[PDB]
């Protein structure tokens, strides 16, 4: 017959009159009733039910006993011992909620091991031993375990496809090196696959990615050198534990569903850093898009199908809270499986006014090309820590979503054979003919990198055109793909564009993002007009707004050696747009710093501007003059407020106030968008949208484009940069290209 025992992980302690405590390592229970105190001390797994009666026979009836054991069985404190298992082992699975005999059957399924890369057959055996010692047969299957020295070994591709074809579940482990990688368990048709993981990895291994480029010009590399035999045995043993957990969970959730839930490695990667001692969980998302297991034609189809917008009531005009947005996109923060490397609060928490965050994502054919990336880290802006954190995360997702992956909507053609549907890139770039002529000379003398003057677009050449949705004309237009996405590869002799970030914006919904995008364009346009025509603008009376934050922040700058003011940049679209300006009163350098922003709500627009001042400015203030690593070094150190009188406010004009900025926003973001497109229409501008949203990412990202609207980079082609000021009476006559501000906008 079978011994009866209480769950093995529980330690039994009787408190005589009425209670008996079942103490466990992770859970404690308490039983009440005489019968328990009498009966349970015999439930230590040394008695059979036939045997139990005799010892207490004359003290407790058998029918009573059955009822006691009956209630114990129903409620899951009671089990039967398993002969195959040791007491300690039995305790491990019962503590998870698994009766020992079910585990014994579960462990019985074999497993295969496969080494890939520079992993030793000795090391394989070491794991085999580790697994065998906890009762797991290993076949010369229900699970294939792959051991690698690097998760990007090409051999893994062939395995993954084999797994997918045969619907074979499998596990990946990297025990060598100073960082253990454990997982995931790939389940075909359920979790992600290796390629889905690989797509994220390739992006997060940037230097290695370039070094492999540079080398093959003239699959992966061994970073796994640092290995103690202890950190090695630690990983293999740890792997074995998790392998067993997978087998046993898999078994019981079918045999006994809903009764026991504990986490396995499925769709998860665990990294243990042996050097600094930190364990981190990383979530692998299944990509509906990837070619190896999903459908790569998804983005292709979306682009060529009409955009469909819809109402989005508001609840500071967005549709959700920052705390919420961060929450559902936290999992994207991971240097292994994620698109954001890290999210750090760069500023002092004891500051209630200034909140700036730091973000990652690494994106080069050269060392100098490599240096610029790793410096381009997205950053968070906010009035609140909550918003700054939400912005810092969402900016990172924004940049990633724009990077040209190769599945984007496209078709090869010439400007001719598209006709009126196509848009010439010069309409968007707005470089003058002289700039294009003195390209090489100008680009050689490079105060700033972003002012790079591309080659002329050769209309005769056939290129790739991406469909964009026009909100004005409610139909599809086309831009060259090179403008729509980051780092689109062009031929060396037709480098006519580098995709920019102007008008790119993320959001909890499409309409929310399109709005922020459109407003980014207005921001830059107004700055461009102001900066290059070097106009004198009126200051804003920050106190006139029912938002104390403005004048509090002023006093904070004032108490940190800095003045702070705001100019009005509102142009012919009437949308509130501003520029915050701050200079250091005392010391060697003025450290002039700028922040812009535009929004229908002037309160928000100013807030955007003044926050853009914080992130850029206050943190670099710490540093002595010499050490500045910023791109804006020559600006921050040398330049003066007196050299740039257009920066300080015009005392000729009256201060702007909250009453000078009419309201044109509603309770609906969709109505605000359609209001924007109309404002553009009134100014004879077309509003175009390309949806950069990635299914695996979820968060909506788009690039808004309004051909003709000006970027605040050194671009002096004919158009709004010259005409709008004269149209506004800000100038009596247009300036000449030569008269434009020779000093570039350094931010």
């Amino acid at each position: 017959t079978p011994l009866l025992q209480i769950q093995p992980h529980f330690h039994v302690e009787v408190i005589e009159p009425k209670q008996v405590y079942l103490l466990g390592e992770q859970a404690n229970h308490a039983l009440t009733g005489q019968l328990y105190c009498q009966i349970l001390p015999l439930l230590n797994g040394q008695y059979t039910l036939e045997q139990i009666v005799e010892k207490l026979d004359g003290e407790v009836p058998p029918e009573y006993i059955d009822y006691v054991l009956e209630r114990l069985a129903e409620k899951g404190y009671l089990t039967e011992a398993a002969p195959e298992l040791s007491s300690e082992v039995a305790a491990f699975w019962s503590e998870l909620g698994i009766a020992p005999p079910v585990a014994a059957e579960a462990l019985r399924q074999p497993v295969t091991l496969t080494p890939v890369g520079n992993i030793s057959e000795v090391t394989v055996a070491a794991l085999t031993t580790a697994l065998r010692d906890i009762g797991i047969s290993v076949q010369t299957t229900a699970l294939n375990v792959v051991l690698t020295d690097d998760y990007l070994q090409p051999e893994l591709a062939k395995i993954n496809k084999q797994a997918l074809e045969s619907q074979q579940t499998w596990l990946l482990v990297k025990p060598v090196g100073s960082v253990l990688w454990l997982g995931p368990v790939f389940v075909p048709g359920k979790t992600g696959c290796w390629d889905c993981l690989a797509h994220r990895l390739r992006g997060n291994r940037e230097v290695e990615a370039s070094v492999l480029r540079q080398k093959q010009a003239q699959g992966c590399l061994p970073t796994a050198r640092a290995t103690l035999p202890s950190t090695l045995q630690t990983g293999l043993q740890f792997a074995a534990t998790e392998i067993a957990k997978w087998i046993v969970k898999y078994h019981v959730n079918a045999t006994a569903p809903g009764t026991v839930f504990f986490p396995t490695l499925d769709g998860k990667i665990i990294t243990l850093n042996h050097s600094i001692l930190d364990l981190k969980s990383h979530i692998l998302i299944k990509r509906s898009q990837c070619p190896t297991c999903g459908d790569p034609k998804i983005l292709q189809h979306r682009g060529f199908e009409p955009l469909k917008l819809e109402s989005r009531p508001k609840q500071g005009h967005r549709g959700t809270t920052p705390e919420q947005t961060v929450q559902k996109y936290q999992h994207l923060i991971s240097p292994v499986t994620g698109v954001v490397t890290e999210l750090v609060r760069i500023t002092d928490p004891a500051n209630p006014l200034v909140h700036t965050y730091r973000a990652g994502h690494s994106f080069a054919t050269s060392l100098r090309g490599l240096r610029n990336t790793l410096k381009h880290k997205s950053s968070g802006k906010g009035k609140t820590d909550s918003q700054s954190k939400a912005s810092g995360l969402c900016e990172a997702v924004e940049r990633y979503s724009g990077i040209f992956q190769g599945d984007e909507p496209r078709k090869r053609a010439t400007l001719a054979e598209l006709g009126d549907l196509a848009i010439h890139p010069e309409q968007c770039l707005c470089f003058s003919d002289g700039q294009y002529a003195n390209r090489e000379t100008l680009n050689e003398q490079a105060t700033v990198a972003h002012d790079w003057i591309p080659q002329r677009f050769d209309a005769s050449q056939a290129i790739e055109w991406t469909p964009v949705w026009s909100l004005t004309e409610q139909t599809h237009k086309y831009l060259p793909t090179a403008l729509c996405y980051y780092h689109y590869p062009l031929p060396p002799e037709h480098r006519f564009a580098r995709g920019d970030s102007n008008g790119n914006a993320a959001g909890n919904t499409l309409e929310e993002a399109i709005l922020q995008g459109f407003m980014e364009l207005v921001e830059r346009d107004g700055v461009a007009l102001w900066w290059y025509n070097r106009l004198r603008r009126p200051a804003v009376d920050l106190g006139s707004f029912n938002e104390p934050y403005f004048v509090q922040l002023q006093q904070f700058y004032r108490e940190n050696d800095r003045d702070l003011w705001v100019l009005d940049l509102t142009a012919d679209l009437g949308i509130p747009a501003f520029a915050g300006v701050s200079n250091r009163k005392t010391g060697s350098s003025e450290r002039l710093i700028l922040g812009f922003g535009a929004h229908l709500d002037p309160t928000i627009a100013i807030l955007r501007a003044v926050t853009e001042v914080n992130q850029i400015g206050l943190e670099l203030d710490k540093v002595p003059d010499e050490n500045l690593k910023s791109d804006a070094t020559d600006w921050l150190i040398t330049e003066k407020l007196a050299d740039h009188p257009y920066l300080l406010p015009d005392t000729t004009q009256p201060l702007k106030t909250a009453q000078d900025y009419p309201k044109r926003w509603s309770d609906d973001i969709y109505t605000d968008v359609m209001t924007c497109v109309n404002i553009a229409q009134q100014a004879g501008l077309e509003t175009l949208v390309i949806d950069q949203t990635r299914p695996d990412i979820g968060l909506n990202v788009v690039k808004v484009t309004v051909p003709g609207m000006r970027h605040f980079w050194s671009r002096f082609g004919e158009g709004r940069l010259y005409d709008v000021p004269v149209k506004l009476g800000w100038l009596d006559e247009p300036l000449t290209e030569a008269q434009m501000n020779p000093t570039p906008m350094p931010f």
Binding site: A30, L31, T32, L35
Partner: peptide, 14 residues
């Protein structure tokens, strides 16, 4: 039933 069977209670501690 017997109060001894009625009094029986098993509870967990958090």
């Amino acid at each position: 039933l017997s109060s001894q069977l009625a009094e029986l209670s098993e509870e967990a501690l958090g």
